[PDB]
Ligand binder design. Structure first.
Ligand code: PBC
Ligand code: PBC
Ligand code: PBC
Ligand code: PBC
Ligand code: MG
Ligand code: MG
Ligand code: MG
Ligand code: MG
Lengths: 357, 357, 357, 357
């Protein structure tokens, strides 16, 4: 009785207070596609996608706009919508940009369904809202800024930070971790992210060194698709290997967990397949005994983790803050879901125009 | 903002048009516990449990009555409720009767949540209602009654039946299947169910004979907890081994699927953990590539299968027809979800009194 | 030919001198079902069940009373009795409360059979009575009470104690172990019990820290049914992982040992299936090379371990002392089987009335 | 040093004499992106991509146009180019449409490199040109048209055809195969392609029936990413399971071969990663003992198979014949590489104009 009536997308390049430097390149602006899903019920679903590089930004918008005719006049039934897209793209390949587009549609449809029922997403999924501990996610910032941002994070009440490492020398990785540690004290989380930058022997050598220093987890040490190599790295470590942000669909998560690639998981609300894919990913993490965190998309991830049996950490990295009202808040380091229907996304319409492609 | 305000259970022994004879004993009447979950929104959630033997009926109701103190005044959030029950029973053993009672609470809570939102359960879960093929489920009836019941089922539009086998001789198993097949023709499903009655070598011998005869699946050939033995049986067969009705929680399903016990699965809405458990089981079946059917509880299973990516068959075995209004209908052998909020269970209040224990 | 003539059950809530605090809740009083099995030979068998939570207490009594008609007029043949119950409950689910109930019948039947033959249980099983080293089992008591209780146990002649841990911080776990170690010295056993309270990475981190401190075993680090997770934890440790109190039947022990979940086992006389299940569990532990301890039920466990080829420790935790004569004694920390027929259980009939439900 | 000096893309929707009907939908016209890679040597590399659905057509062209900045002024060294693209898209996801775009650049770059050296691509790779046996590839055509196209293919000299199957009834699959077989005789190949349309149990049942009829291979019986399910299907067959057209990169082929998903492989020159990926795929097939065929892209696949140690069949399915001069010929069913530099693609420039989007 509630039909999808239209799809509107806006491609933006939004500024970042701090560029996200990684060992494999810098993300200085966030290329985003903002999504509005119109319905016959007088509500509009909102979601957005992260294109990672501006090279893929216009292609992703064009893809979504050409997909509108697939979903317009279909019922607002996101699980059924997802199965339809899966089958329609089964020859072309239901992965990559195509899967990311379907995930954006999925996330806007669930927002709209929450609005239809005038209830937050987390409650529509049958769970209570709860605060979720969050770590402040930084980047490959150099010892000076990394220590400064770590101190500010602790001052704002976060109990952990993530820095991105993979400097030319191991001693540079260690100097950054040591400087943060001396500034925050022992009772504080320091996660580190290599962004796929090491080969397997280098990952073992750097990770065992970092493990001696004291870190909370070691994230994507090597190529994301190399589940076997991640298993070999994890086999040489006590500290948990963490991965999952690049899993395109829960089927990729299933392959990785099946061979023991990691003791922690952090799906990406976009790449895992939206709310629908997240729910399936959480069922897997529960059965494999994997504490499950989020990657980006903090607005919807606060709802999703509240419904996740093995919920671990929320990643605070506010890529869309310049175009989304800050209804999501942080109290004592914990993300607090807003008392709003659906996801709680309200566009900053006066700001969006500044960034349109 | 919506709280549970009461729990009421009624234990009944209800009549069956045909006793469910099995290889390991006869269920002549259905011992049920009917559950009413009152809420601060006025609506009342309805579910029921199947105790299998009257020996367990009063024990199950007593357990549920003593569990009221754990859920009354809690939010109507089934997923959070389930996590609380899992933790509170973790020393006692969150399995068996305790797990079945938690599932009954879960199913009533989801019915109530659908009622709060004035929407059928399938749509609350994000899926469209679709008709789902049902087989008419019979029992260890002997050649004559098995054939007559198969003919009546075909006349009612069903495209498959299930008979329960495990007679003293294999030739008696074969005689029933052959007689059904003569009466219904080649283009018709005949599922067979041993109800755990064989050892592994006997299962292999009888199953290969049934395979030659022509059957749709072979269900629970040996002890339900012996997943390894089911794998060995399946390794000698082309016809699929079917199991799952006795999995207590998705964790037992995960163990069976992990070792290849069966090529088909049929979780029981009660034993698998209610809606919350069924959704998790549904995610496992998709990733393991297992077509997923239901066992009993046709009223809620029609909703649940419509949301299940690998949905296969609905088992039609109407244990509670004498106390529940026939709002679930069958058109051309397909179960049709009624346009009613939540599950669509309406008590026959004047009938329930005739059967109270 | 000795027949069973009747079954009498009494549900009691008995006081504990020290509540059993665990990381997942406190057992402040012990809910027990006391069992009398009447026979045609003028002897009555005695046993009891531990319901863990009062929520299950009346349900468990009701179950046993409704099972009386299954066993009355049957031969006093516990092994044959066990097979009949397994079959009768094979549809309902021969696990959880049902399996615990059958175990209570088994344990009283073997007591009565010892009485028929005027001989202690251990001798009826073909073994010599022998002293069995026992550890004094405490709980999550805090550093001060844990140290005081450890000293008291040392003064009484015990060579080991178990404390339950899983405080909010690892440093709190370590502080308790350190303060016990200061007070008892190096030549003394300190077992620790997490009661399923940790996820797999937290278990590895905490267990590797406790291992450096010096502990005797690490019991149930994670969810009891997660055998694979227990193996992953054990794979990171030199100290043995200990589990088994929550195995419902030897078949669950067989699954856990087959995948290497633990290097020690401790079946629970109730949950493992009584004497009949214990003897089978002992055969499994011998072949898998697993030293085998007990959990609770110290009265019957002294008999059982004396017949167990890999017998390790007896757990001294006197749940039923307020209603059972102290015929079991401890000399130099060793449990000493009483020279009484059957198990040596004599009811304190004057005390039982004070705690009836 | 030769540099890339420009990249031009043209999106076309070209006509097909016969629509490619499949069990999951029909490709009635071919959406292609034609690629021109201009170089400082004057020669222009040519290649094209198949978008499968018009829904992806403009998005793929937009992506390629925005990738121009990454490759213009880079050396014409395809292997180094591919490494650079893999690194640049390692955050976005080097798969799906992005990977197909990189493959189109790779195939154009190798054609240009053959042109720089005035030599056919096969000779550039160090192999002699040799005729490659080709099967005429049809679709889900129905009994009458399937048989007519098979008869025509046999008259044109082909020794094998492929039909696409997965009709509603297995009996219809069999009728098509039987009708073809009567018309072409026993000494003739009949490949069949389910295009992922079956679940695992249905694949086993249909495939064992097909194997009794006599077919040459069974292609993509189930979901393309379900390598484990393909292994289970292959475990029940003597006839080989064939897959590969949907592997995105040789790394996906490595995962599938590592678990034994199939006894035949058929990489797609586009999805596998162009020439560079094909050569890596061919090294894998050799070591795993897998006869390796092609999927689509017949113009360059004739060159690549002549260099492939386990080369098996070439798929003749002429998607681009409306826009590419017919320099590739077929003698006695064998593809014959043209005596032209690089790949031998010459645009039909006056025809391309008719199909531009
Ligand atoms: B056991 O030793 O783990 C136990 C648990 C709860 C109460 C008593 C003993
Ligand atoms: O946490 B991540 O790996 C990340 C990568 C790129 C941009 C932002 C975050
Ligand atoms: O389908 B079954 O296995 C079943 C068993 C007992 C009663 C009813 C149905
Ligand atoms: O052979 B193939 O599977 C194919 C699929 C779609 C279009 C063309 C060819
Ligand atoms: Mg990362
Ligand atoms: Mg059955
Ligand atoms: Mg314990
Ligand atoms: Mg194909």
């Amino acid at each position: 009785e509630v039909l999808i009536t239209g799809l509107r997308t806006r491609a933006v390049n939004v500024p970042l207070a701090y560029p996200v430097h990684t060992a494999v390149g810098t993300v200085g602006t966030a290329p985003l596609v903002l999504i509005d899903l119109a319905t016959s019920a007088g509500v509009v679903g909102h979601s957005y996608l992260f294109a990672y590089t501006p090279v893929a930004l216009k292609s992703l918008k064009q893809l979504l706009d050409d997909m509108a005719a697939m979903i317009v006049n279909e019922p607002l039934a996101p699980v059924s919508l997802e199965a339809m897209l899966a089958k329609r793209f089964c020859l072309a390949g239901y992965t990559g940009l195509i899967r990311m587009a379907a995930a954006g549609i999925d996330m806007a449809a669930w927002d709209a369904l929450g609005k239809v029922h005038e209830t937050p997403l987390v409650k529509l999924l049958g769970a209570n809202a709860r605060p979720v501990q969050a770590y402040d996610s930084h980047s490959l910032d150099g010892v000076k800024l990394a220590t400064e941002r770590a101190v500010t994070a602790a001052e704002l009440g976060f109990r952990a930070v993530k820095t991105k490492i993979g400097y030319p020398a191991l001693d540079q990785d260690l100097a950054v971790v040591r400087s943060i540690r001396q500034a925050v004290g022992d009772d504080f989380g320091i996660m580190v992210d290599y962004n796929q930058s090491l080969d397997v022997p280098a990952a073992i050598k750097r990770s065992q060194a970092l493990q001696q220093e004291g870190v909370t987890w070691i994230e994507e040490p090597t190529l994301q698709h190399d589940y076997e190599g991640h298993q070999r790295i994890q086999s040489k470590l006590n500290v948990p290997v963490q991965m999952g942000e690049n899993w395109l669909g829960p089927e990729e998560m299933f392959k990785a967990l099946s061979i023991g690639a990691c003791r922690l998981a952090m799906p990406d609300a976009m790449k895992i397949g939206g709310v629908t894919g997240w729910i399936r990913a959480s069922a897997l993490a529960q059965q494999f005994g994997i504490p499950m965190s989020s990657h980006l998309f903090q607005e919807i991830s606060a709802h999703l983790l509240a419904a996740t049996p093995t919920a671990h950490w929320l990643e605070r990295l506010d890529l869309a803050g310049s175009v989304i009202e800050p209804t999501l808040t942080f109290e004592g380091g914990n993300a607090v879901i807003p008392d709003l229907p659906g996801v709680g996304i309200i566009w900053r319409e006066k700001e969006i125009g500044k960034y349109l492609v």
